[PDB]
Amino acid sequence: SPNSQYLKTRILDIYTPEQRAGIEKSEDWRQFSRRMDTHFPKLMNELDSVYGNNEALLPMLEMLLAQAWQSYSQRNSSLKDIDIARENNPDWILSNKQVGGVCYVDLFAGDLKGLKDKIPYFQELGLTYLHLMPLFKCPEGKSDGGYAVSSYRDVNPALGTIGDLREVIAALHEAGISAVVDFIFNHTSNEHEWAQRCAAGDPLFDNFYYIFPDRRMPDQYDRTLREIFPDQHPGGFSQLEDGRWVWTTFNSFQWDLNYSNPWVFRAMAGEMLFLANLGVDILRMDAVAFIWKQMGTSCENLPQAHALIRAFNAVMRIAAPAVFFKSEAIVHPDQVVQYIGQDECQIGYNPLQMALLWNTLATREVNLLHQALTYRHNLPEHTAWVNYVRSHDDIGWTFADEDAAYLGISGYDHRQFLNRFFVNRFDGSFARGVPFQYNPSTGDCRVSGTAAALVGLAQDDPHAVDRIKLLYSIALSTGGLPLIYLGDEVGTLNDDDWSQDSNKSDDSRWAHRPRYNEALYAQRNDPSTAAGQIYQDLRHMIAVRQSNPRFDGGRLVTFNTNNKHIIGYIRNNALLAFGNFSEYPQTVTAHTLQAMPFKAHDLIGGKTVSLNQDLTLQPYQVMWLEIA
Numbered sequence: 001s002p003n004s005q006y007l008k009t010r011i012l013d014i015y016t017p018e019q020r021a022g023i024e025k026s027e028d029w030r031q032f033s034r035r036m037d038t039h040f041p042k043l044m045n046e047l048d049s050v051y052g053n054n055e056a057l058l059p060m061l062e063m064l065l066a067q068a069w070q071s072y073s074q075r076n077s078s079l080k081d082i083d084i085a086r087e088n089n090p091d092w093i094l095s096n097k098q099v100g101g102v103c104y105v106d107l108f109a110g111d112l113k114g115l116k117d118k119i120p121y122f123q124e125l126g127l128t129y130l131h132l133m134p135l136f137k138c139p140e141g142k143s144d145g146g147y148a149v150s151s152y153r154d155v156n157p158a159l160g161t162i163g164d165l166r167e168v169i170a171a172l173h174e175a176g177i178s179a180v181v182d183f184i185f186n187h188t189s190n191e192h193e194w195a196q197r198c199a200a201g202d203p204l205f206d207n208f209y210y211i212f213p214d215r216r217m218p219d220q221y222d223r224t225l226r227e228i229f230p231d232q233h234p235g236g237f238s239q240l241e242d243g244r245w246v247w248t249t250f251n252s253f254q255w256d257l258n259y260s261n262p263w264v265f266r267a268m269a270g271e272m273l274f275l276a277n278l279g280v281d282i283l284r285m286d287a288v289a290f291i292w293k294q295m296g297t298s299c300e301n302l303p304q305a306h307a308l309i310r311a312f313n314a315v316m317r318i319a320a321p322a323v324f325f326k327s328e329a330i331v332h333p334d335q336v337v338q339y340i341g342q343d344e345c346q347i348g349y350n351p352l353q354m355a356l357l358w359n360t361l362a363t364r365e366v367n368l369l370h371q372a373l374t375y376r377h378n379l380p381e382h383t384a385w386v387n388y389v390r391s392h393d394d395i396g397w398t399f400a401d402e403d404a405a406y407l408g409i410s411g412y413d414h415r416q417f418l419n420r421f422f423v424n425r426f427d428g429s430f431a432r433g434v435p436f437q438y439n440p441s442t443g444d445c446r447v448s449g450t451a452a453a454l455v456g457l458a459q460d461d462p463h464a465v466d467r468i469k470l471l472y473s474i475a476l477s478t479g480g481l482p483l484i485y486l487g488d489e490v491g492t493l494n495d496d497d498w499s500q501d502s503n504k505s506d507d508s509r510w511a512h513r514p515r516y517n518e519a520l521y522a523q524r525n526d527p528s529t530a531a532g533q534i535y536q537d538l539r540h541m542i543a544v545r546q547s548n549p550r551f552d553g554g555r556l557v558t559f560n561t562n563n564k565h566i567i568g569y570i571r572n573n574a575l576l577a578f579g580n581f582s583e584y585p586q587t588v589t590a591h592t593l594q595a596m597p598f599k600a601h602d603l604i605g606g607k608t609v610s611l612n613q614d615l616t617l618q619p620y621q622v623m624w625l626e627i628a
């Protein structure tokens with residue numbers, strides 16, 4: 001395999017002798033050259049592990065490196081300053097100062113111009129990170145909410161223009177907010193130029209997707225494939241009008257890209273560089289688990305998938321150091337953590353904590369949550385979790401059956417209960433969610449519904465507001481970057497139009513993708529309303545988190561509370577957090593608290609608490625005690 005020095009001499013061959021001499025002495029070339037020497041070894045090693053002696057690897061690599069240099073040369077000076085800043089501050093993602101929010105531009109603010117006008121609010125809330133849902137062109141009508149991309153560079157006209165997007169990004173940076181967008185790299189819409197040309201037989205796009213003549217191979221693959229949207233189609237394939245079959249992990253109009261073709265990697269690396277130069281700070285790597293297929297396997301979390309992501313990482317280390325990755329892997333806990341690393345995805349969603357927060361509200365027992373925080377929370381240096389309560393997606397019960405069995409819990413029976421409970425098919429449940437993708441062949445099912453709907457705010461459950469406060473307190477204090485599903489801070493309920501919308505009726509996730517509720521947002525400063533109670537409560541916690549150094553970093557040590565309903569953990573050996581998941585008062589005994597300081601200030605309620613006696617927490621009460 002080639003070396004950095006040799007490859008760089010070929011990159012410069014596009015220049016005449018006179019021009020070349022000037023490039024060699026330029027600052028941009030010096031920075032690029034240094035990064036190449038440092039990071040190229042990883043790029044080469046990762047690409048070699050995937051493609052091996054493929055005749056197309058070297059040509060593809062040289063084309064990619066040439067593009068990378070051109071991309072870096074074009075990169076704006078301001079962005080280059082951020083590149084250097086983060087190159088020397090790898091833990092910027094682990095700071096307690098960070099708090100993120102996510103929203104759909106159209107649903108939250110109408111269009112990109114309208115979103116820019118909401119920035120003052122984001123600053124008011126304390127956000128330093130903003131994830132904007134799919135912004136580029138997609139099919140009209142059904143597009144999996146923008147996740148079926150028809151173009152990676154042309155902005156959805158309904159939202160605005162590329163010009164508007166640049167203004168929004170610039171405005172976000174001006175307000176001290178990082179711009180986060182999706183990198184939908186596992187598949188494109190069936191209307192994307194690449195898809196059309198591949199299917200049409202254009203040799204330039206040969207093997208850009210996985211297309212078969214009949215069901216022979218698809219049938220073989222289906223023996224081991226998990227169904228993501230069983231309501232849409234069985235297995236992982238859809239049939240074209242001409243009779244052929246195509247790999248479609250998700251909707252039939254979403255065609256999986258073929259990374260076994262090195263030219264597909266190059267193509268996607270090019271799109272990544274485009275996003276990088278728009279000023280994006282973090283790319284949400286969508287459906288990372290599915291980017292490599294292999295007959296006889298689940299075609300999820302395969303070795304080459306991880307290698308390809310690390311190759312993409314190296315490209316950014318060389319051509320846009322400021323760009324970090326956020327892994328979106330909603331899979332088994334053992335597999336989730338494998339995507340997280342300084343050289344792969346620096347941050348990643350923490351579905352286990354999220355799923356268990358809801359599990360605990362249902363069961364009132366913190367056993368599973370305590371187990372996860374004890375054995376699956378701490379991560380390698382320079383990496384962090386993205387902790388959340390809700391997202392634009394359904395809730396999947398992705399806890400480990402092996403972990404549960406150790407606690408004497410049957411994963412299958414337990415999920416049956418959780419599903420019944422959250423869709424209000426269990427006596428006394430306070431949840432008002434709706435099922436998503438019930439699979440009668442496996443019995444699996446997920447839950448749709450907003451955070452407020454799931455805690456009982458729809459029917460005005462007196463404990464709803466407190467449940468919301470408790471869940472968010474944990475995402476905000478365990479260690480990692482907390483992400484607020486915008487709308488949750490004022491208790492937004494489910495959308496009640498989706499069910500009758502023919503373009504949404506078959507995807508219950510729309511139940512929890514409501515529009516900006518003008519009425520609730522206008523009540524955020526009124527302490528007598530649920531909206532104001534939730535807003536001030538969350539805003540207070542955000543304020544404490546960002547101003548108090550005891551929350552810095554992502555490590556934690558659990559504390560045995562000796563009360564099955566109370567979770568407890570310590571941050572930096574200075575902040576003791578207790579969370580009561582029971583709708584009844586619960587106590588931590590004086591005996592349990594003997595090693596703690598006699599007194600400690602509670603940052604939540606603002607009072608001094610005595611720890612030399614029984615400590616009783618009110619229903620769903622949360623305490624953040626300064627013990628150092």
Ligand SMILES: OC[C@H]1O[C@@H](O)[C@H](O)[C@@H](O)[C@@H]1O
Nearest residue numbers: 144147148250286287328393
């Ligand atoms: O595109 C398929 C899926 O990709 C995921 O990254 C998105 O979170 C989900 O909403 C979408 O359905």
Ligand SMILES: OC[C@H]1O[C@@H](O)[C@H](O)[C@@H](O)[C@@H]1O
Nearest residue numbers: 363410413414415416417418
């Ligand atoms: O509802 C009572 C019990 O039912 C079981 O099916 C659940 O797995 C358990 O968590 C719950 O406490």
Ligand SMILES: OC[C@H]1O[C@@H](O)[C@H](O)[C@@H](O)[C@@H]1O
Nearest residue numbers: 560562591592593594595596
């Ligand atoms: O010293 C405080 C510790 O004492 C131990 O012997 C108790 O089992 C434990 O619950 C308490 O936290």
